Amino acid sequence: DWPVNDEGGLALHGVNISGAGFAPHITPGKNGTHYFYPEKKHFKYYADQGIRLIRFPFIWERVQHSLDSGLNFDQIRLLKKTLDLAAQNGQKVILDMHNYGRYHGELIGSSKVPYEAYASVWRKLAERFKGHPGLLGYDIMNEPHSTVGLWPGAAQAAVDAIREVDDQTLIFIEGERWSSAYHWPLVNANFLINDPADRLIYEAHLYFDDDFSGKYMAQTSRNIDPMIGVERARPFIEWLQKHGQKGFLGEYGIPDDLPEAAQAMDNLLAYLNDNCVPSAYWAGGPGWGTYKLAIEPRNGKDRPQMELMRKHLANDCTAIGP
């Protein structure tokens, strides 16, 4: 069910779309003020650009205000709208619970947030979204970090729960240390989640600055090697090949004002094509303003990162690699 290109090959390279996970310190917060959902124009523009793959961040706190409460009707309705609009424009969506291994600041697997709670919300979500034509899958957790050994058990708890209700949808599994691609083989040496459906994909993020953060601060963004993207991806790709697993580069992005990051992005996307590995650019959609990384057009004008992308949209892949 992975999205395909019209001319052949797979829709490997997509875009992260804002902005339902914005200002996560403000919960539940208000749609239209603190966070934002995309409209038909955003889906239409990316489709026009040949992009059929979308990763869409939301936060747990906004689908469930408390663990003793049910799902928020409006937030699900907003997510359904996202899936609908994506589908109408020939795109498929990866829903990303953008929660960093935490719920209301507490670790999933802690006494305040039992594994049971995390399994439930995903089982309820899978019940809500099951069979939707705009749904590609569930990125069950974004950028787990500092979880003190909690994350692997949490991941399995959610996967087991989803599969009780939905054996067909893809599940995307991220790893510890903010799911860093470069650190993957050290941090997730023996990371393995069980899925009888054979519908799991491991997902890392990869930025080009000295601290791996994607902040692109001035001191950490001098001297970007044009092969730094390939170099930071390779460890992840080789880990996947060794364990016979499929991969996804769920985040990567470059500031507009760094010519060296542009070269690094080109070489990175070339390398991912050679392995038939998909990716999602950070980021596009509503509410980004003049964010340097943002790939959202301004005044009708395509951004340099979108122009850089187009060269790499074509492929002859029939399966997700590596």
Distance CA 281, CA 295 (A): 8
Q: Are 150 and 107 in contact (CB under 8 A)?
A: yes
Distance CA 260, CA 208 (A): 10
Positions of chain breaks in the chain, given as the residue before each break (C to N > 2.5 Å): none
Distances (CA, A) of 211 to 43, 100, 103, 261, 291: 32, 18, 26, 14, 19
Q: Which of 174, 203, 251, 296 is catalytic?
A: 251
The two tokens of residue 248 are: 């996804």
Distances (CA, A) of 262 to 39, 168, 254: 29, 37, 7
Distances (CA, A) of 98 to 55, 59, 143, 204: 11, 5, 8, 14
Partners of 282 in the β-ladder = none
> Looking at residue 30, which CATH number applies to its domain?
3.20.20.80
Phi, psi (degrees; rounded to nearest 5) at 172: -110, 120
Phi, psi (degrees; rounded to nearest 5) at 58: -145, 170
Partners of 15 in the β-ladder = 54, 281
Task: Tell me which H or E stretch contains 162.
Answer: helix 151-165
Give helix 40-48 / helix 73-88 axis angle, nearest 10°.
30
Give the range of the structural domain holding residue 279, as residue numbers without chain letter.
Answer: 1-322
Q: Are 277 and 247 in contact (CB under 8 A)?
A: yes
Q: Which of 61, 143, 174, 296 is catalytic?
A: 143
Closest CA to 296 of 39, 23, 35, 6: 39
Distance CA 273, CA 77 (A): 35
Per the annotation, the verdict on 143 as an active-site residue is: yes
Q: Are 163 and 195 in contact (CB under 8 A)?
A: yes
- Cβ contacts of 105 within 8 Å, gap of 6 or more: none
Distance CA 289, CA 68 (A): 37
Place of tokens 């961040």: 57
How many CB atoms are located within 10 Å of the residue 138 CB? 23
Looking from the CA of 112 toward its CB, the CA atoms found within 13 Å total: 7
Domain count, the chain: 1
Distance CA 166, CA 175 (A): 23
Distance from CA of residue 171 to its chain's centroid?
A: 11
Question: Which approach determined this entry?
Answer: X-ray
Per the annotation, the verdict on 251 as an active-site residue is: yes
Task: With H, G, I as helix, E, B as strand and everything else as coil, classify residue 238.
Answer: helix
Phi, psi (degrees; rounded to nearest 5) at 200: -115, 145
Altogether, the residues listed in the chain come to a count of: 322
Q: Are 17 and 42 in contact (CB under 8 A)?
A: yes
* Cα pseudo-dihedral 135, 137, 143, 144, rounded to 10: 130
Q: Are 246 and 202 in contact (CB under 8 A)?
A: yes
